[PDB]
């Protein structure tokens, strides 16, 4: 909260196997503003992702 979010750095990173987005398009994220993000963090087997 209370901060500015350049998603280009994340989306252009080769570090990621997936970037699937379910009510917004990842190309358009920089053209959005919203109340809160909430980031949820954990680890699993790849076969379960």
């Amino acid at each position: 909260s209370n901060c500015v979010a350049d998603y280009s750095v994340l989306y252009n990173s080769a570090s990621f196997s997936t970037f699937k987005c379910y009510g917004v398009s990842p190309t358009k994220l920089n053209d959005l503003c919203f109340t809160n993000v909430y980031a949820d963090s954990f680890v699993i087997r790849g076969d379960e992702v």
Binding site: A14, S25, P26, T27
Partner: protein, 45 residues
């Protein structure tokens, strides 16, 4: 998996792209028999 109408990905927006209403077929096959060497002469943008 990116070669579909309206897909987006590290290939399917930065270079090649199919129309958002396409009519056609996509056909692919494994080629590690012949195109592997590694072979750096295959490139993307």
């Amino acid at each position: 998996r990116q070669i579909a109408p309206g897909q987006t990905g590290k290939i399917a927006d930065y270079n090649y792209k199919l129309p958002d209403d396409f009519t056609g077929c996509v056909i692919a096959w494994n080629s590690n028999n012949l195109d592997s060497k590694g072979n750096y002469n295959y490139l993307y943008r």
